[PDB]
Design a protein around this ligand. Sequence first.
Ligand SMILES: [Zn+2]
Ligand SMILES: [Zn+2]
Ligand SMILES: [Zn+2]
Lengths: 312, 11, 257, 186, 169, 34, 59, 179, 89, 322
Amino acid sequence: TAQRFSNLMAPTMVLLGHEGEIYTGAFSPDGTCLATSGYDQKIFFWNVYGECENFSTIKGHSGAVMDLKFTTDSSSLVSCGTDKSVRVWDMETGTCARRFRTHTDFVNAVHPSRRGVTLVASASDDGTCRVHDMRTKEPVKTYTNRYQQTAVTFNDSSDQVISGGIDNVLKVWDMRRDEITYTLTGHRDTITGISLSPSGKFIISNSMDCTVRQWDIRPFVPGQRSVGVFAGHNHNFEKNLLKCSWSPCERFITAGSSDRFLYVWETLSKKIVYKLPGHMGSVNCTDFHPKEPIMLSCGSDKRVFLGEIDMS
Amino acid sequence: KPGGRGMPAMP
Amino acid sequence: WEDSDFPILCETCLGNNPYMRMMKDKYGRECKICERPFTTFRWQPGKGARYKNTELCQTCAKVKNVCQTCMFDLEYGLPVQVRDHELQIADNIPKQGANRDFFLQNVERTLGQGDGTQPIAQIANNMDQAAHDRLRRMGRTQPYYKRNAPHICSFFVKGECKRGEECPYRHEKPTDPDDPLSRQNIRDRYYGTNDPVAEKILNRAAAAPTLSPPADTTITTLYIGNLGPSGAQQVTEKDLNDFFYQYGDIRCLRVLT
Amino acid sequence: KWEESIGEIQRARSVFERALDVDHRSISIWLQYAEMEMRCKQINHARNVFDRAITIMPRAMQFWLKYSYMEEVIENIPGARQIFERWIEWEPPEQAWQTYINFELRYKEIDRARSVYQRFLHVHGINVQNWIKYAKFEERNGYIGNARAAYEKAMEYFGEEDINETVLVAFALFEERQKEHERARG
Amino acid sequence: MPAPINDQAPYVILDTTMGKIALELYWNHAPRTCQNFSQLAKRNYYNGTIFHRIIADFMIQGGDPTGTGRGGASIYGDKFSDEIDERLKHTGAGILSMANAGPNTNGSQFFITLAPTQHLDGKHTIFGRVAAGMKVIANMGRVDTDNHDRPKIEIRILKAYPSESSVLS
Amino acid sequence: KPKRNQIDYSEEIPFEKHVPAGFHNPSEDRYVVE
Amino acid sequence: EDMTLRQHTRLTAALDPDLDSYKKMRECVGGEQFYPTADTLIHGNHYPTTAAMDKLTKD
Amino acid sequence: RTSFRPRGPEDFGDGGAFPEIHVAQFPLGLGLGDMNTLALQYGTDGKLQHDAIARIGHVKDKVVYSKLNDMKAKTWNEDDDDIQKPDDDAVIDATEKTRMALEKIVNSKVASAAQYIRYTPSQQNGAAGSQQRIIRMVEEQKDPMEPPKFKINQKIPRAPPSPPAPVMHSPPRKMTAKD
Amino acid sequence: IVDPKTKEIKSNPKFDQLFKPESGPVNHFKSEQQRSQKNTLTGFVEPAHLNEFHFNRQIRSFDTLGYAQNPTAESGTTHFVGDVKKAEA
Amino acid sequence: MMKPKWHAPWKLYRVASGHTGWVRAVDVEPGNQWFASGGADRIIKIWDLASGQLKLSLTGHISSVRAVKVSPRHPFLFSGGEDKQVKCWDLEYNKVIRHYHGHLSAVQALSVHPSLDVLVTCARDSTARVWDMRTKAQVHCFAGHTNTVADVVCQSVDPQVITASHDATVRLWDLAAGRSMCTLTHHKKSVRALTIHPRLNMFASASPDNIKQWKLPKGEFMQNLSGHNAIINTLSSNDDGVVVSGADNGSLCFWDWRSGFCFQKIQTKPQPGSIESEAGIYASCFDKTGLRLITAEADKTIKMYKEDDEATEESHPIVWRP
Ligand SMILES: [Zn+2]
Ligand SMILES: [Zn+2]
Ligand SMILES: [Zn+2]
């Protein structure tokens, strides 16, 4: 006998069915489902429990899918891809509720607003950070940068948009000012992903310099906003936009890694305590199940791994 | 199917 | 028949480029030593090399412990004859028809028990650290790509190569036919008998200078030199005391800085 | 045998190792293989052959007899004891114990020979004759207190009802030989 | 009047499935290391553990409860710092020394040498010697092993306890 | 005669079967033939 | 079996014992190794090369 | 003892070398010279492994049958636990395991009838600066016309049997003169 | 607490359990080639998947130019491998 | 020993005469409606278990039948011949549709795997071969015995195959990997019969020396059933704990598995014109309830046995006698 920690059927699961290189994956906030996609363009939905069967698959994308996030109420999935389009999928219907189309170059990264009106922040290789609204064809805000943007998030109040890119430094725009209120400086190479903390106080940002840097985005900080740096993961010559994600308890942080290992760090000490093998290629995305200590990781090896951990 | 994590090489 | 995911090959055959395209077979060559049919690999090791391919099968590569293409030893990169001489492994491998096929069948079964990591008994177990350290000194420490890379343009040897800039093959002097190093077969090399390049290496290894003690039996004194200059570069007494007492009991020690 | 003679003994091993693969329960071959190694003076090979033979056929008596004799002729006698000790672990039936006893008697170890009898009676002692032979062994060495004890314990061992009286007569006649004759009538 | 019985016993006795071994603990050189061994002995921590490593004409090593070479922990929690003191050196067979993965990382694992290895001095904390039973050590030093130096049949430390004397019986 | 149709049983030990390892030293033993 | 037992009982009756030499071994070596039970490790090889091997060969 | 210096194996007694005497110490033949046959060894049950001969040359298979505990009659009217027939999960897990291996074999067997490798080379001379290589495998295209490449009726004797299992009989019932 | 090296891991150890190094000395008998991790006769062979197009790029740079971006996992500071004077220049 | 469990005496009530040569198979249909038997008259005859009526004769074999098994999962009957053929019979057409070719000399046992579609057959040539009963493919050859094999029994859990041989060994086989890993050498004489006890992790094997009992999967030894010192070649074992051993001399012993107590010796009397030599037995099977035994006989008859009931338990008793 051995210790168990989740309702998974086995302490790790191997999900097979993809043929494309899986570039993104996220859980539904209700914990019932996860959705995963990448170069196959098909978005695969999986149940979290039991046989974890691939109950649904959505086509419709025709350029590979960079990033994919659920809306907070789990009514819709927002996903974006290199077809220069942001597509919002109704979870009950499995159909494209909105197809935002004003980007001029590949859209790589997406983040829905947490509450209030449903807004979708997006960042692209045209250098624009754009916030779309479900109710209008035209976007609400377009913030233009000289250099391509490949990561985006709102803050928790959904009134500051944080975008990172080729600049390494970060264009953080405040939606009442339409100005950069501050920049976060420490990244020596491009920013492959940004994820907002559950409470919204912090963001982690992952970069091709092989570090994750934790930033305090609260309105007042008396000094430098850099809280800490995490290392151990690696970015290879593929230059992927390796993502990052928070644990819902905030005590743990994850990032994609080219060395096949699933990294977990302790937020305060920045030490590693989980280094989980099993992948055969670049782990492009990693996420925590929102209610249960299940780790999701999606890799360039065409495989999705579910596994349970002792989150302490 | 359920499975397990093959340990890779190290330097 | 025998199959595997990846070939037993050293670094000199693969060497210069970390990234490689390789062609794989299902069994599609007969092993040059044992004529069993075996799964082949073909690769070009970087710019300017030829396409090289595996020539031994893995059981023959395991039984000598040699690279499947160049048949030098996997640990030292020396010819088999040199290594077998220093290890004192005689010409034990059966060679004829049924003997070597029967022997290879039993080796393959025994290695199948073992785990797949190792050459067979004789070289895998071999203990003599003094013999190993002899081999390490002769072995050489850098890969020799010139021997890996290309064939010679025999129409150019005749002097008539209408292909000339386009050619693939080399436009340079061949090895002279007096030069016995040209003659080497495969089987002589693999079994390690009369291998010309091995004999050249062994002769220099025997020629290499080393101490033999004086005829005066009662002498127990060693001169030591090349200690460097006096000052901070000079070794202390402890640096001799805490090393040479590993070998035996010094009766007297003297230093001349 | 033929290859051996030539000093091709290195090949002759190969012949017998192949021969053992065919039969292996081969007791003729095992004897011939060991005897070949002994005449060649190979004795560590001869030991290895016996160690295999007795391991594979622990209840073929011939190997333990031959092997103990080889070690004894070499004066290995600690090793010859260990062979007999190893043999007895197989609870070999009568003749094995008698040969181990007789071995210790040739050294004149007699108290070690007494230890063998006491263990022999534990396994075999259902047979009366082992008790009578034990008591005769004590009597003839002169231990006669042991001989009385041996008969009296034999009677106690067989019991009150199923009186093994061949013990009782043997006990009576021993006491008659002592001139205990009052005991002998009793 | 003699000192009372206390945890600074001069010897430790190992009862093993190969014979009995006694170790002399050099309290004047590595007292924290010796009391780690003697306490873990007293706590039965080594009881039932195996000699998971044997290198012929070099070293015998054991004292990992997992038999992996990665397990074990000291009484101080995990690692503790070295007690290198170059008046002691690995001068020969039967030197008893504490195994470490790196500087100042001594754990529960210990090893017994089989050769003079003075170029290893200062990297491992010597803390005793084989007091008796070196014939057993020489017997173990020739047992044949796999290519990871693990015995094909275990030598198990069935009991360890401290003792006031080197006596073996 | 130059032949390939049989193994030559004198050139090398045919179908060589090695004596197993055992507790004793067998390299120790030595012999000569005369 | 029984003819094999007959050679051993005949051959051991013929075999004159070592006893004065055997007593000497019994003094120094005798207790610790030389008595062994089945389950004790005799150490040292015992290989009395010239006399014993010729004796065994003739035997 | 630090006024004394050992000089031979007598000087150590039954103990090991002394680390406080900075001299080359050899309490036995150990380490004097230089570094193929199993050693005599004790078992975990305190006996000595003479039977260990029988375990050479096997895959660590169940046939430890060389003691005598395993030939004497073990208990009658047994305490039923291991002796129960295994559960429904066991026959299911066993049956599924058996087919799934042979199935993958049979598909290649009737055929007989991108993908990359990351290679980490213990030979540290390496490609330039790289402790590993990553390499592309492609399969040689089988020419559908080409007939079988090689002669394969080559015939050799049966492989030697696995080393003998100990014979484990009860002692011979002698039945000499009349039978 | 530790978990030994196994063909697959069923049960997700943290990191102190898997990674913590094997304690004690290391052989003088078998030095820098032989000590390394291996599985096949020379090497650790494991399957891999990559971004084909980028892997194709890295061949072509080493071949034409003399340098490449380092393929290895855990490359550390050795990001590039080749004629480093050209890589920096 | 400990406490024999009491089992009722066994009584005879059939002689079915109709084979024109020795009978040497029986197997009982899963349905328990009918049993098949095979004979040295090269004919398979299917008999109706209750009435004893005959209702088929199947004439495909070439020289002798001596293996029959009825599959517990398919409507197929398998049979093996001294003519070197293993045949599959389809019990929806009564014709033959498969042949399994590779045996080099007489087949003399076969077994049908309880949950895979896999068939295993013993022969002279000293092997057992594993067959895939769909494709006819042969996908193991259990060489490793050194003399003719004739018994094999199969089970779903490891060891999936157990084989018994005239080399006086039993072997336990890893059916997935195709290797052997036991040799139960304890028999002095040819092990002509096997049986796995139908509700314990335990099996018995018979030779002229003794009948021995074994604990699975290890194959470790349990105390012997002794004194039936004939050439034995049948075992049948019963859901209630009875084992029965039939012998070439016609004698037939019944035994209590739990104790090895013997509490019947039946000597068969052969039907007219055959008496002295022909009395012998070589088949047995129990019906699926375990309340009738069928035996096949060198006197060219099938006989069937049944348990007495009339006043038995008080007249018969067994004491303690450890
Ligand atoms: Zn070959
Ligand atoms: Zn090479
Ligand atoms: Zn040319």
